[PDB]
């Protein structure tokens, strides 16, 4: 079998293949995650270079791993499918062997472990993908939001963004998001998520996707018109 060590250290103590995988993430469309008091919202950018697209059948950016956990990403699209499939298999494997669904932290730890494994295994390259994993633990009303990256490190975030121009939207979130008082309602959480994407997106038409996840496996994706109403209200307040 092909055993070639592709991810290796350089004289300055860097693994370039892992670092170049982060550059692939930088190229990917922007993804954002914001957790309110009783919910988590996942926002995703859709680049409008591709029109004549069939939005019914085109792979959506946010993927359900189980009925209570979701996963969005930034980077190579094909790479993300492999992580999602593995995550979905592990979710059912956990339910089967332990009789409880996975915690959001556990699912994140698994996906992060897969990413790490691909940084010190022979004949393979790292995943060019960073993920945002969100949801609610079984019989728990505390929101969960985690981030992973090609190196395999993961951590919990009150709010986070990844992908192209993520530096700008993180700048926005850092000054707008208050920890002592997070978005109390679904409206406030979605509004803040749309606002953050409007710093980067371009047009607020079909370029913004929003997915709201609430406790007890209550997950819904907002439509174009519902999002368009947020886009309208934000700019009308801005004209002042």
């Amino acid at each position: 079998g092909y055993d070639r060590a592709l991810s290796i250290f350089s004289p300055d103590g860097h693994i370039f293949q892992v670092e170049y995988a982060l550059e692939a993430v930088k190229r990917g469309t922007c993804a954002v995650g914001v957790k309110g008091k009783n919910c988590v919202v996942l926002g995703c950018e859709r680049r409008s270079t591709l029109k004549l697209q069939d939005t019914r059948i085109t792979p959506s950016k946010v993927s359900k791993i189980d009925s209570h956990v979701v996963l969005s990403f930034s980077g190579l699209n094909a790479d993300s499918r492999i992580l999602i499939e593995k995550a979905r298999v592990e979710a059912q494997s956990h339910r089967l062997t332990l009789e409880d669904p996975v915690t959001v932290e556990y699912l994140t730890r698994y996906v992060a472990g897969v990413q790490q494994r691909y940084t010190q295994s022979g004949g393979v390259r790292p995943f060019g993908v960073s993920t945002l994993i969100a949801g609610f633990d079984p019989r728990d009303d505390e929101p969960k939001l985690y981030q992973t990256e090609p190196s395999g490190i993961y951590s919990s975030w009150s709010a986070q963004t990844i992908g192209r121009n993520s530096k700008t939207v993180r700048e926005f979130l850092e000054k707008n998001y208050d920890r002592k008082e997070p978005p109390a309602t679904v409206e406030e959480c979605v509004k803040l998520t749309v606002r953050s994407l409007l710093e980067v997106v371009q047009t607020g038409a079909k370029n913004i996707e929003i997915t709201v996840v609430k406790p007890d496996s209550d997950i819904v994706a907002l439509s174009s018109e519902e999002i368009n109403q947020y886009v309208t209200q934000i700019e009308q307040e801005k004209q002042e």
Binding site: E23, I57, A78
Partner: protein, 244 residues
């Protein structure tokens, strides 16, 4: 040892691109243009054969349009030999699904499977990727008529109208201009041929330089028919639309 001669086909560039995938896409940009257009009552697949000869046996020839099953077909752009490897795998996958569930495979599931195979060659194994881009035209009872494309990266997307191969930039602009949502198959047939006629590198668009196919519910009552056009039938539709 052997390491000396390894090109390392599955690595990132400093910019975060996959070298071999990008170069495979460069190869595909020189292949004959293939176009797919989805209508409310069917799908059209049109494709240009590359600089042919008068001594080529056209009626028994197939380089662009292939049948995966009774409901799904593909248009090819790139290395034909590479495409046939993948096509035969897809044909088997469709039959595996049918045997397991006793239902015809949903279009997206077949597309995802082939796209995952392409993805694998970019991440592990140390082999060159498949220099192929597909346009998938298919029907199932969930989403109805569907158009997809996949490329050597293993990434796939859905479309109302799309082109692959040569002059896609020019072709996509022309499609984006004249396409409408309430369009029908007969209109889509005309759009596909008109787009090829303007984007072609050849002097004139003739029957012997084309492969054509439709997927219609124009089959007697609630069912779908695949029509791979014969040379004489391509010649007739060229006259009908007013190109020759």
């Amino acid at each position: 040892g052997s390491r000396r001669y390894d090109s390392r086909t599955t690595i990132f560039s400093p910019e975060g691109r996959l070298y071999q995938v990008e170069y495979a896409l460069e190869s595909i940009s020189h292949a004959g243009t293939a176009i797919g257009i989805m209508a409310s009552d069917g799908i059209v697949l049109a494709a240009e054969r590359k600089v042919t000869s008068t001594l080529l046996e056209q009626d028994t020839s197939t380089e662009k349009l292939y049948k995966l099953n009774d409901k799904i077909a593909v248009a090819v752009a790139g290395l034909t030999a590479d495409a046939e490897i993948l096509i035969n795998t897809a044909r088997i996958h469709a039959q595996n699904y049918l045997k397991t569930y006793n239902e015809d495979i949903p279009v997206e599931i077949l597309v995802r499977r082939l796209s995952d195979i392409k993805q694998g060659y970019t991440q592990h194994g140390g082999l060159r990727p498949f220099g192929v881009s597909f346009i998938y035209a298919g029907y199932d009872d969930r989403y109805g008529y569907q158009l997809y494309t996949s490329n050597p990266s293993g990434n796939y997307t859905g479309w109302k109208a799309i082109s692959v191969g040569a002059n896609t930039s020019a072709a996509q602009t022309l499609l984006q201009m004249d396409y409408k949502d309430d369009m029908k198959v007969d209109d889509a047939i005309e759009l596909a041929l008109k787009t090829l006629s303007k984007t072609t590198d050849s002097s004139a668009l003739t029957y012997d330089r084309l492969e054509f196919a439709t997927i219609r519910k124009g089959a007697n009552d609630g069912e779908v028919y695949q029509k791979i056009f014969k040379p004489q039938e391509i010649k007739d539709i060229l006259v009908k639309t007013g190109i020759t």
